[PDB]
Nucleic acid binder design. Structure first.
Ligand SMILES: CC(=O)O[C@H]1[C@H](C)[C@H](O)[C@H](C)[C@@H](O)[C@@H]([C@H](C)OC(=O)C(C)(C)CC(=O)O)CC/C=C(/C)C(=O)Nc2cc(O)c3c4c(c(C)c(O)c3c2O)O[C@](C)(O/C=C/[C@H](O[C@H]2C[C@@H]3OCO[C@@H]3[C@@H](C)O2)[C@H]1C)C4=O
Lengths: 73, 302, 73, 116, 132, 36, 73, 53
DNA sequence: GCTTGACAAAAGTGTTAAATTGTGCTATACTAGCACAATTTAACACTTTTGTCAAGC
């Protein structure tokens, strides 16, 4: 996927030391906010929110921190 | 070749200091500063000093400034190190660098070696503050003050945090409660945060925006002429009124002088009680409303 | 206001109104009939840009008989 | 085709003017007037119609006082007045001053003249 | 320019053209054109360095709110803003007393702003706003 | 009435602290000229 | 000679928004306290959604659809 | 408004010429107040020097 | 044809409280937010001026 292709490029964001590495993966799309006829009515952009599944790992303490990130519409 | 490229060339010509070096410079800079103040107070109080002691006291004053400038030129790289992170937010890199140098100056002025802390530890606060304080003061063409620039950044901060908590951009009521302010306040803040645009910008093709702005106070030839024709019509009505009556109506509205006049001030010229002027005004106005006199000006209403 | 104007206000008894007229009029040469109207109001919980209270859009259509000077091809 | 007469016919006697320059602002959005460009001035100069050319560049567009007096003359039915100084020219003088160029309009006497 | 004898610089320039004819004569010939141009005129050549800069009237660099409440303004205002900002900061650095590197850096920046104000992009990087 | 370098120095050190500093600095130059 | 299609034209603008995010994530790591950071703390999306908005909003490639007749569209 | 003048001359503007022309020295990089929207004094649109609004 | 006193509305005026605005500051080492002073703006009690009415010379 084009989005997965650009996400494979950033993952992982590695520290200069490499102590902390943050990984992106698994793009998520939610159902559209409003219909095309409703967007042209209310002067809003036809869009669907985009969640991602990131992660931040600390090499020093070995902890794992997963989270859900909202990129935008 | 390039301006910034030239500045880094010269700041690098001074070797960075170590802790002991900083402390010594911080001592000489301080002794020279007190040696300077000491001599100034003496003249006011008298208190002449040994001719010789004064000599090497004045040299300590002179010697402190080399310590001051040597300390600045050594930590210039630190300013650039901090200024890089703020480029592209509406300020040129060099301006950020200079304002940072101002913070570095005060850091040297306020440094305390007795605390035993490394200089970069304390100078970083002043350079960071001097750069951001400067951005709020200058980065905007309309120049919002600092405290209002502070609440804008805080509001956008809140909207950002909340956006992740909510999954959508907030409504004015939510930001108002989250920031502990009124919904009409946050709306008023978002109007202040608007930034201007360039007239010299072009929009489709070869047409700059500037050519589309109307001149509002420009005289419109169709109305100014009718105004001249109108004031001639009024000049006719005045000849029909009594000489004292016509004189009163003008002064009350200052047609000839261009400035209104109150009744007591109209009483002095006519030497009559101001109430009488009010009475004469009432009788003359009703006569102006009389059918014959006002028929023409109805059409001149608009 | 103008000294000449303030008198006419006193004669014909029309109070000089406190506000300026900035109304939406039809452009020169344009004609037709009103099809529909869209209204977004601040009182009702409509979404508006900061500082904007009410929005009203008027849609005007017109029949165009083929006329002299029109371009055919 | 989408080119229609009703949309392409424009006529103007008087109307709004630009804020920086005092010329009529073009386009149908502003009831604008037609542009008398560089080539058109060449044609008028070729004809030798000095007054027609002066009229187009002084009292039809840029004379802040000239264009309003001619309207007063047409309504009163009087002769049309002598044109003034094009605002474009006065703006040009100021733009040269802003470049640290001292430009002085001079009469036969050699005395400077206040452009106001 | 203060220590400039503009007659002897001219005359010494005046004679060399006829004697040292060649590639160097052309250099002196062209150079004589500007030197003599100042000689005939009673106007000083000091004008090439400005102690003060004129500010164009506001009406020609307007700042007006197009409807919608939003504001538009000429680039000249931001260009004047750059110049006056760096001018005042320089005053501040002088009054404080500052290392020559800092003061000299400010003077170079000030000169560049006046250059950008007059002919932007003519010398090196042109000053840009939003959208480059 | 600005806030000058003197004010900032006096705020963090008493006159007795500055005086002792000046004495040290004075003895340094004193040793230089007097002692070879 | 190739043609960048719509999907890639979006992909390129997504890449730019993620790259300026990479810089902010990097600086955010340093001045932030270790163990006080989560995927949410390091990420401000302002560049990403601004890249999407700017492209659709400003880019030459995103064009007002010409709809006078269905053949034109 | 003569409209009939003979010569037009140009030359280097000395500091005194510039100094003379100006109706005042603009001292601040301020355009207009952000709330009142009125021109800021000593700024770029200062009525004190440039003229009334 | 005009004047007087009672009178309320409006416009100033000086004094005070609130808000707005500007400056200073942060101490591991690294090459935004708050406190405080200064200034401006509002609020207000209070005084003078101004427009107005009824009644009468
Ligand atoms: C706002 C907008 O959409 O304008 C669009 C454009 C006008 C509308 O799409 C319009 C509906 C148009 O599609 C139709 C229409 C019938 O044609 C016409 O309108 C005219 C009258 C011109 C021709 C005609 O009718 O005869 C159909 C045209 C049919 C054909 C075979 C054609 O010629 N096509 C065409 C025409 C173009 O000129 C350009 C063009 C361009 C690029 C990268 C293109 O690929 C263009 C293109 O393919 O680069 C330039 C320098 O500048 C870019 C300018 C604009 O781009 C925007 C992009 C952003 O949108 C909002 O902010 C940005 C704004 C500032 O610029 C252009 C792309 C530019 O001239």
């Amino acid at each position: 996927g084009g989005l997965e292709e650009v996400l494979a490029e950033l993952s992982p964001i590695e520290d200069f030391s490499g102590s902390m590495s943050l990984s992106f993966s698994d793009p998520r799309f939610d159902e559209v906010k409003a219909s095309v006829d409703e967007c042209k009515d209310k002067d809003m952009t036809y869009a669907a929110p985009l969640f991602v599944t990131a992660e931040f790992i600390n090499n020093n303490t070995g902890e794992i921190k997963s989270q859900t990130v909202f990129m935008g519409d | 070749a390039d301006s910034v490229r030239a500045y880094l060339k010269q700041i690098g010509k001074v070797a960075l200091l170590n802790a002991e070096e900083e402390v010594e410079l911080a001592k000489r800079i301080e002794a020279g500063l007190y040696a300077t103040q000491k001599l100034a107070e003496l003249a006011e109080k008298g208190e002449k000093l040994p001719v010789q002691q004064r000599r090497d006291m004045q040299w300590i004053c002179r010697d402190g400034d080399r310590a001051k400038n040597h300390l600045l030129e050594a930590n210039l790289r630190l300013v650039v190190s901090l200024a890089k992170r703020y480029t592209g937010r509406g300020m040129a890199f060099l301006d950020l660098i200079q304002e940072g140098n101002l913070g570095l100056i005060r850091a040297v002025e306020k440094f305390d070696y007795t605390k035993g802390y490394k200089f970069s530890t304390y100078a970083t606060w002043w350079i960071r503050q001097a750069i951001t304080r400067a951005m709020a003061d200058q980065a905007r063409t309309i120049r919002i003050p600092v405290h209002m620039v502070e609440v804008i950044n805080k509001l956008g901060r809140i909207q950002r945090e909340l956006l992740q908590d909510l999954g959508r951009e907030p409504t004015p009521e939510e930001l108002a409660k989250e920031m502990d302010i009124t919904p009409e306040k946050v709306l008023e803040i978002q109007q202040y945060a608007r930034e201007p645009i360039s007239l010299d910008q072009t929009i489709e093709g070869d047409s700059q925006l500037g050519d589309f702005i109307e001149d509002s106070e420009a005289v419109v030839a169709v109305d100014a002429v009718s105004f001249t024709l109108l004031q001639d019509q009024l000049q006719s009505v005045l000849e029909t009124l009594s000489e004292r009556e016509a004189g009163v109506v003008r002064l009350r509205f200052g047609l000839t002088d261009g400035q209104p006049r109150t009744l007591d001030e109209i009483g002095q010229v006519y030497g009559v009680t101001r109430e009488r002027i009010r009475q004469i005004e009432s009788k003359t106005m009703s006569k102006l409303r009389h059918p014959s006199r006002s028929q023409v000006l109805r059409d001149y209403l608009d | 206001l103008t000294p000449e104007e303030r008198l006419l206000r006193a004669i014909f008894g029309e109070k000089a109104r406190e506000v300026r007229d900035t109304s939406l009029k039809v452009p020169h040469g344009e004609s037709g009939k009103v099809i529909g109207i869209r209204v977004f109001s601040r009182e009702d919980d409509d979404e508006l840009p900061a500082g904007v209270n009410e929005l009203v859009r008027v849609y005007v259509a017109q029949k165009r008989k083929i006329s002299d000077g029109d371009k055919l091809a | 085709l989408h080119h229609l007469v009703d949309d392409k016919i424009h006529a103007r006697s008087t109307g709004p003017y630009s804020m920086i320059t005092q010329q009529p602002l073009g386009g149908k959005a502003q009831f604008g007037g037609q542009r008398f460009g560089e080539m058109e001035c060449w044609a008028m100069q070729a004809y030798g119609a000095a007054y027609t050319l002066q009229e187009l560049l002084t009292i039809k567009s840029d004379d802040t006082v000239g264009r309003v007096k001619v309207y007063e003359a047409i309504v009163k039915g009087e002769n049309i007045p002598e044109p003034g100084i094009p605002e474009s020219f006065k703006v040009l003088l100021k733009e040269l001053q802003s470049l640290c160029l001292n430009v002085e309009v001079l009469s036969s006497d050699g005395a400077a003249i206040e452009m106001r | 320019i203060e220590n400039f004898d503009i007659d002897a610089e001219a005359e010494s320039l005046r004679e060399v053209i006829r004697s040292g004819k060649g590639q160097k004569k052309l250099r002196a010939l062209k150079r004589l054109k500007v030197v003599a141009a100042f000689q005939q005129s009673g106007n000083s050549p000091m004008g090439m360095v400005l102690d003060a800069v004129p500010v164009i009237p506001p009406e020609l660099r307007p700042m007006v709110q197009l409807d919608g409440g939003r504001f538009a303004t000429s680039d000249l205002n931001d260009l004047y803003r750059r110049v006056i900002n760096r001018n005042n900061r320089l005053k501040r650095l002088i009054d404080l007393g500052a290392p020559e590197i800092i003061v000299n850096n400010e003077k170079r920046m000030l000169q560049e702003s006046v250059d950008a104000l007059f002919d932007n992009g003519r010398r090196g990087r042109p000053v840009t706003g939003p959208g480059n | 009435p600005p806030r000058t370098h003197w004010d900032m120095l006096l705020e963090r050190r008493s006159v007795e602290e500055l005086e002792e500093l000046l004495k040290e600095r004075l003895d340094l130059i004193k040793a230089k000229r007097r002692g070879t | 000679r190739r043609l960048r299609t719509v999907g890639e034209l979006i992909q390129n603008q997504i890449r730019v928004g993620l790259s300026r995010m990479e810089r902010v994530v990097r600086e955010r790591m340093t001045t932030q306290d270790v163990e006080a950071i989560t995927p949410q703390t390091l990420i401000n999306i302002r560049p990403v959604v601004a890249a999407i908005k700017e492209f659709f909003g400003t880019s030459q490639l995103s064009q007002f659809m010409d709809q006078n007749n269905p053949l034109s569209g | 408004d003569v409209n009939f003048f003979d010569e037009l001359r140009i030359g280097l503007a000395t500091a005194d010429d510039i100094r003379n022309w100006s109706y005042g020295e603009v001292k601040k990089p301020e355009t207009i107040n952000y709330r009142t929207l009125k021109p800021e004094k000593d700024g770029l649109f200062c009525e004190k020097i440039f003229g009334p609004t």
